Design a protein around this ligand. Structure first.
Ligand SMILES: C[C@@H]1O[C@@H](O[C@H]2[C@H](O[C@H]3[C@H](O)[C@@H](O)[C@H](O)O[C@@H]3CO)O[C@H](CO)[C@H](O)[C@@H]2O)[C@@H](O)[C@H](O)[C@@H]1O
Ligand SMILES: C[C@@H]1O[C@@H](O[C@H]2[C@H](O[C@H]3[C@H](O)[C@@H](O)[C@H](O)O[C@@H]3CO)O[C@H](CO)[C@H](O)[C@@H]2O)[C@@H](O)[C@H](O)[C@@H]1O
Ligand SMILES: [Ca+2]
Ligand SMILES: [Ca+2]
Ligand SMILES: [Mn+2]
Ligand SMILES: [Mn+2]
Lengths: 239, 239
């Protein structure tokens, strides 16, 4: 069995295992701020940032045809402090081609280039979307399962508990081809669940980079924080 | 769309909507005790009890072939107060033939007759199993997805937070045929998830009874409480 696992109970500036892109940075307090937090402590608009684990993950064996199952968990908080305009844009966990660089920001969340489906993205992502774009369901925030497109194949509305920490659990089971996602707010006790069929051998390249990305909006104060406190990941490829 | 929903924020003695079977009873404090709690306040061994919603649920239309999606949530607590022997047996949410009566107790959880698979059960169940029987994985407690058999097609170990309230969320999405289950302990923050493919049109009769069942063990003090504090359910059959 070929495995890979990692766990960050908190983040530390200078950590060997994380690539930081765009606006993303790690605070001395141990927080990964995906998008820029200004001097005052307010989130800046027009910001996009990502982090990637430094080692690629083997998701399926192009010789035997075996497919990996994985699990990932992270805790994040989104605070929307402006009364106007509408907050934007959200954060996302993603898996895609290695040597990945940030794509477009705003509603594309630093992961996709435009709003069309393109199998060449070879990317799977689980979004926590805060702004309803032309391709989105109306309810925001929502969790979305994105397969080669920012237009989710399935979404689940969730109520934001402003500024509070949410816990996320994402599992992909290769036998069933089920990607199942859970979001829990300890603060309020709210629990949300969403699941969909994803054929990773068809969707992803055999080796992938895994990461997190966040983005704020395209106009003044269409923004919010996208802070991550911890992140663990584990994958197992049968041999 | 043919729908059915109900929600018990707490239970009330005399409620019109619940059938009580075996040892099950509702306390004036609003708790559904699936298995007998003795005078002292200790759980009795050799107890089996169930509750069923009084109205049947239409799970699939035998004329058009449409299939219902559903969601159910409940909060329960299991307290294992004896040091010896091992605690048993667990509780379960189940969906099966209407006019259902308790089956065997102990490790069969009041739902199945023996340990063999039998398509005639026409029953789907999500168990929270506390005793490792000859057909069980070794880790207990575990959540299990049971399709026409007490021998789960998939299980997920979870650590008991003794006597604490657990929140459960179960969803079945007909399009994907995915049954996805989540268990959260607010007390500790632990989150568990398990999902599997279930073809309800093949498994269940077109009309079903939905219920909860609990059982304690076959020898002195092989027991624990199986208390439920709230239960909601919602199903939608496309037309
Ligand atoms: C580049 C843009 O990205 C998505 O839209 C973002 C949206 O963009 C507005 C912009 O705020 C407004 O000043 C300009 O006049 O029109 C743009 C729409 O084209 O701004 C909100 C925050 O207000 C979010 O950031 C949206 O993601 C997209 O949906 C657009 O199609 C376009 O690609
Ligand atoms: C009837 C029995 O049910 C399951 O076993 C339960 C287990 O039964 C023991 C019993 O406690 C012991 O006194 C007797 O000598 O052997 C039985 C096993 O056959 O008891 C534990 C608690 O200790 C749980 O209640 C188990 O569910 C089953 O696994 C057996 O095959 C049998 O059908
Ligand atoms: Ca959006
Ligand atoms: Ca058992
Ligand atoms: Mn979206
Ligand atoms: Mn079991």
């Amino acid at each position: 069995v070929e495995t890979i696992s990692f766990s960050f109970s908190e983040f530390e500036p200078g950590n060997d295992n994380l690539t930081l892109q765009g606006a993303a940075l790690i605070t001395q307090s141990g927080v990964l701020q995906l998008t820029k937090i200004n001097q005052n402590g307010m989130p800046a608009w027009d910001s996009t940032g990502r982090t990637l684990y430094t080692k690629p993950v083997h998701m399926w064996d192009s010789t035997t045809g075996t497919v990996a199952s994985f699990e990932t968990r992270f805790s994040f908080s989104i605070e929307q402090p402006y009364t106007r305009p509408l907050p934007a844009d959200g954060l996302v966990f993603f898996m895609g081609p290695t040597k990945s660089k940030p794509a477009q920001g705003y509603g594309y969340l630093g992961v996709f280039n435009n709003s069309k489906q393109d199998n060449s993205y070879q990317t799977l992502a689980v979004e926590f979307d805060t702004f309803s774009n032309p391709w989105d369901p109306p309810q925001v925030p929502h969790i979305g399962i994105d397969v080669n497109s920012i237009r989710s194949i399935k979404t689940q509305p969730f109520q934001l508990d402003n500024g509070q920490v949410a816990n996320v659990v994402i599992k992909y089971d290769a036998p069933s081809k089920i990607l199942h996602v859970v979001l829990v707010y300890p603060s309020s006790g709210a629990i949300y669940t969403i699941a969909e069929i994803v054929d990773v051998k068809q969707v992803l390249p055999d080796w992938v980079d895994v990461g997190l990305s966040g983005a704020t909006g395209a106009q003044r104060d269409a923004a919010e924080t996208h802070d991550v406190y911890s992140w663990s990941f584990q994958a197992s490829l049968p041999e």
